[PDB]
Symmetry: D2
Subunit: 295 residues, 4 copies
Amino acid sequence: SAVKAARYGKDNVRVYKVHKDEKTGVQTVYEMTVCVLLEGEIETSYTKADNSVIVATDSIKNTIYITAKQNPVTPPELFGSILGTHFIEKYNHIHAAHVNIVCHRWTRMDIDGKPHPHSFIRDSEEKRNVQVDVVEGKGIDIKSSLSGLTVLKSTNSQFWGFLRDEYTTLKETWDRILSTDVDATWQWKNFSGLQEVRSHVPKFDATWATAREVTLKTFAEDNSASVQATMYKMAEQILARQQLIETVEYSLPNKHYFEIDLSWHKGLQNTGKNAEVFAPQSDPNGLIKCTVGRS
Amino acid sequence: SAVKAARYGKDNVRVYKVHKDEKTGVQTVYEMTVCVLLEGEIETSYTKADNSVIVATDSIKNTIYITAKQNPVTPPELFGSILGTHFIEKYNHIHAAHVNIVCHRWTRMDIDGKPHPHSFIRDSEEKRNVQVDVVEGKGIDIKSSLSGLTVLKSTNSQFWGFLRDEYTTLKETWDRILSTDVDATWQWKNFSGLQEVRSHVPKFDATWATAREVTLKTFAEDNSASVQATMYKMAEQILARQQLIETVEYSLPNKHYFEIDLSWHKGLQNTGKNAEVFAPQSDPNGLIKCTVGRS
Amino acid sequence: SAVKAARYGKDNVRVYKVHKDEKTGVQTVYEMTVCVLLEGEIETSYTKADNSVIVATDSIKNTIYITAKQNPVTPPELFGSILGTHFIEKYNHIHAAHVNIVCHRWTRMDIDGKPHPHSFIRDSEEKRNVQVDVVEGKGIDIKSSLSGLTVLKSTNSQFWGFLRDEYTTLKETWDRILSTDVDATWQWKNFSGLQEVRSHVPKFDATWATAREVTLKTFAEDNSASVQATMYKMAEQILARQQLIETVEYSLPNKHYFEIDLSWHKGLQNTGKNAEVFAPQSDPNGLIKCTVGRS
Amino acid sequence: SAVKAARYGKDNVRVYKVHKDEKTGVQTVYEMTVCVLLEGEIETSYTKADNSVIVATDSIKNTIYITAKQNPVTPPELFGSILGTHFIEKYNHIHAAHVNIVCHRWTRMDIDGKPHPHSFIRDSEEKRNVQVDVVEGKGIDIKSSLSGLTVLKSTNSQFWGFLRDEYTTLKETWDRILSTDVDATWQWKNFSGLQEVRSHVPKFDATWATAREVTLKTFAEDNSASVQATMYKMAEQILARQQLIETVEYSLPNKHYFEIDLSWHKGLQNTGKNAEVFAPQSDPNGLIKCTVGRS
Ligand SMILES: O=c1[nH]c(=O)c2nn[nH]c2[nH]1
Ligand SMILES: O=c1[nH]c(=O)c2nn[nH]c2[nH]1
Ligand SMILES: O=c1[nH]c(=O)c2nn[nH]c2[nH]1
Ligand SMILES: O=c1[nH]c(=O)c2nn[nH]c2[nH]1
Ligand code: NA
Ligand code: NA
Ligand code: NA
Ligand code: NA
C-alpha cells in the first residue's frame, strides 16, 4: 500500500480580534472559526513514523493567532490567502494550504437610535465563509459563501406540472409556503498569488453584499415556479454583477409546511383557500442544488 | 408505593399560523413550538392500567391546532391561557394544564427600503417564551421570558476586588470583554382567570419590548463592575416599569474570551493594553443567576 | 427592589481523571462535566458592586480540579458531596453549594476476548448524573439519575381504552412500537453530612445498577398497557429494592413510529398485521412523567 | 449563463423496517436515514420553469418506502444499489442516482443473559454509512464507512521529533492521552451493475466488521508514534484483508486532554509522571486525514 493523499492540521480554532479607533473611540470586533490543513511531502510521517516532516498542529494554531495579530482579518478572503501563503512559503516541503474560515455576526447595537461604540449583538446564526486553497505554483483559489440564511414566504410560491406516475401522491398547487436555509457559494477566478488577491480586496465585501441582496430580493419577489427556477434566477444575477466570479452554486432545502385538515372536527375549514394553521415538518426535506456558470 | 405526582401530554408541537389582510394584501406569520402537560385524577392510568382517564397525547396535539385555528396565537401569554383553560374546563378530572410556548422569529423583510407583504427572515435564534400554569380554583400563573439573546461588549467591563485565597489565580482587571446569552424571565401576578388575562393583553407585548430594551441598554451602557451588578440593574428597571410583574429572574453565562500571550514569538505584544487577538473559550463558563422582587 | 434569590458559579467544567494500578498495570479513566453554584451572603455583589463577597467562578473551577486531584471521583454522589461540603466549610458567608455532575461512558475495550489495560470506548451517550445540594445546617440532599438510555421494542406494546371525544382521531391499538429515551431519578433520604454519605458509599453504584437493570427488564418484559403503566412498574421495583430511596421519578418521551399506508401503490399492504415499514417521527412526541414514593 | 451541474431530491428520510420470524418469534429491526439525489436531463426545470422533467421529491420519498417494503434493507450497500438502479431504469431522462444511507444502532437487549426477541437498545451514536452512486453506463460506485466511533487510550501514545521553529511551543512527549472519533471509509472497486453487487453481498457485512475490528485493535495495541502513523497501520490492514477494496480513507480528530499544573496550590504535583487530573479540550482539535491505496 501507498499514501495516495494526505492532509492534516488544526480545526475549530476560534479567533476574536478587536480594532480600537483612538480618535473616535469606536471599537469593531471580528470573530471567526478557522481550519488550516496542509499537504506536501509528508507521507513519511504516516509510513515511517518520521515526525520530522510535521509542522505540529499546535504550531499551526499559534500561527493563526500570530497572523491575525499582524494582519487584517477582514475581508476573510484576504486573511485566508495571507494565512495559506505563509505556510507554503515558510516550509519547503509543504506545498498546499487549505484554509476554511467561518465568520460569526457581531452587529453593532443601536441604543436610542445611535450606533454604540463598543457593544454588539449576534443577530442570527447566518455565516459568511471562505475556502482558500493556496497551492505552490498554481496560485490561490477562493470560494466565498453565505450560509444559514433562513427565510420564508407565505404565498407566491407554486408547484405544478411535475411528472406524475404510479409513485406520485403529491397534489399540484398554485399557492404554497416556501421556506429554506440559503447556502450560496461563488467561486472566484484563480488568482496568481497574494499580490493579485490584494488588488481585488474591495470586490470581496461588495460581492458578498450583492449575493445576499440578490438572494433576498429574488426570493421575495419571484412568483416562484419551483425552488429550481428561483435559485437559477439568483445565480444568474450574481454572475451578471461580478465578472471575476466563474460559478455560483446554490444548495436549498425545501422546508415543508403541511396543511392540516381539520374538517373532521365540526367541519372546520383549514385547507386550500382556507388554510391558516400549518404543521412545519422537521424532516424529510427536499434538497435542491445547482451550479451556474458562464455560457 | 403511591403516585406522588404525575403529568403527561405532548411536547414539541410545531405550529405555524398565517394572518392575511384582504384589504392591504399584507400577510403576517407566527411560528411556535408548544408543550402541554396535564395533571388531575389520572393516577389509575399508572397504577391500574386504567386508560379511561387519559386524554390521548395525540388528542392534545389536535386540540392545539384547533385552538390556534379558532383563536389569536398572539400574544403567547393569551394563547397559552386559552389553551390551558380549555383543558381544565373541558375535562372534569383534569385539574391543571401546563403550557409552554417558544416563539420563533420571522421578521418581515425590507426589500428596497420598503416592508415586504409576505416574505420573512429568521433574524437570530433569540426566542420569546411563556410558561402558563392554569390550575382549577387557583387562577392562571404566567412567566414570560426572552432567551438566546447573545451580546458582547469589547470594553467597559471590569472585575476586581473579589475574594483571594489559596484557591485563587485569576488576576484583577479593569478592562475586559463581556459576552453572554441573556435569559430573562418576568413573573406576572396571579390572574383570576381568562377574563383577567384578556383585560391585560396590551401589557404583554409592551412588557416584552421593555424587558428587551432595558436589557440591551443597560448591558451597553453600564460600566460593569461584575455580571452580578449589571444584571441587578436590569431587573430593577423592569420591575419599576411594570407594576403587574412580581419578580424578574436573570440567568447569564459569562462566556470568557482569554488574552493570548504572544511575547514568546519575537516579543510580540498582545496582553493588557496591547491585547487585540483573543481566544473565545467554549467552556467552562461562569453562570450567574438572580431573582429580584419588590421591597 | 430586593434580591430574593441568588446563586452563581462555574458550569461546564470538563474533568478527566486516570487511576493507574502499578501492580497490574491496569488503568481506569473517569470523565465528567461538573457545575457548582453557590449561595450565601452574597446579595451585596448584586446591589452594591461589593465583589469582596465573591469566590471567583475561576477559583471554583480551580477547586474542582484540586478536589478531583485529592479525592476519589467515584461514585459521583461521594465526589459531589465532598466538593459541596468544601465550599460551605471553607467560606463563612457561603451557606449552600449545589453540585451537578454528568458522568460520560468510557467502557474498557475487549480486544481478542480479553479486557484491555488502557483503551476505552464511548459505548453510547447514556449518562449517569447526580445533583448534590449541600446546605449548612440541613445536611446533604442527593438526587441520582440515568439519562439518555434510548430503547425500542417492536411489539408487546398496546394502547386502547383511552378517552374518546370530538378532539380524538387516534385509533386504539393492540400492537405497536414503543420507543423512548429513559430519564430516571432516585432521591436519597437526606444525609446528615459527609460522614453519613461515606457510610453508604457501596449503595450508590449498586442502586444505579439496579435502576438500570429494572428499567431494561421491565421495558423488555412488560406487555405494556401504556407508557404510564410501564413506568410505574419500574419505579415500584426500584423503591422495593433500596430502602434509602424516598422517591423515584421517570420522564419518558413516546417517540412515535407511524405506519405508512402504501395501498395506493399497486394495493401494497403495509398496515396493521402487514406493517413492516414505518416512518419514525422526529416530533411531536408524547411526554409522560411520574413521581412514585412510599405509601 | 448555463447550468453546469444540478442534482435534487429528498434528504433526511427516516425509515424503520421490522422483520418477524414466524417460526422463532424473533423480531429484528433496522432503522436508517436516507438521502437520494438525482441528475439527468433536468436543466429546463431551472432555466425554463419546465417542471415536466421533475420526479417530485415527494415521489422520491414514496419510492424509498416502497423499495424498503419490497426489498431487503440490509446490507445497506445492496439496498442503496437497488434504490439507485430503480431511478435510472425507471426514468429515461434521469441518468444518475446518488444515495446516501446512515444506519442507526438498534442492538438486541440481553435480559438475564439471554437475547430478547423484540427489545433493542441504542448502544452508541456510532453509524454505519454508505454512499452509492448509480450512473447510467458507468456501473455502481460504493463507498462504505463507519463514523462516530469514539475511543480513548490513557497511555501508549507519544509525540516527539516534530519540526521546531519560531512558531513552536508544544513540548515533546513520550506518554500522552490519545482520543479520537473515528471516521473510516473504504471504497469498493466499481461494480458493473446490480447483478454484480448482489454477487458480493456477503462481503459487505464482513468487511464492515473487519474495518471496525482492525480499527479498535490497532488503536488499542499500537504504541503510537503519531495519529498519522497509527491510522496508516489501520488502513494498511483493511486493504490487505479485502481485495475488492481500492482505497481506505481515515479522518481522525486529535481530541486533546491537557495537563493541569496545580503546583501553584501547596506544591501539588499533577504534571508529567504525576498527572492524574486533565482538562479535556472542546476545541481546537488536530485533524488528520489520509487515503491509502494499492502500490
Ligand atoms: O499525533 C499528532 N499528530 C500531529 O500532527 C500533531 N501536532 N500536534 N500534536 C500532534 N499529534
Ligand atoms: O402510552 C401512551 N400514553 C399516552 O398517554 C398516549 N396518548 N397517545 N398515545 C399514548 N400512548
Ligand atoms: O462578572 C464576574 N462575576 C464573577 O462572579 C466572576 N468570577 N470570575 N470572573 C467573574 N466575573
Ligand atoms: O420546488 C419544488 N421542487 C421540487 O423538485 C419538488 N418536489 N416536491 N415539491 C417540490 N418543490
Ligand atoms: Na512550500
Ligand atoms: Na377540570
Ligand atoms: Na459556610
Ligand atoms: Na435513465
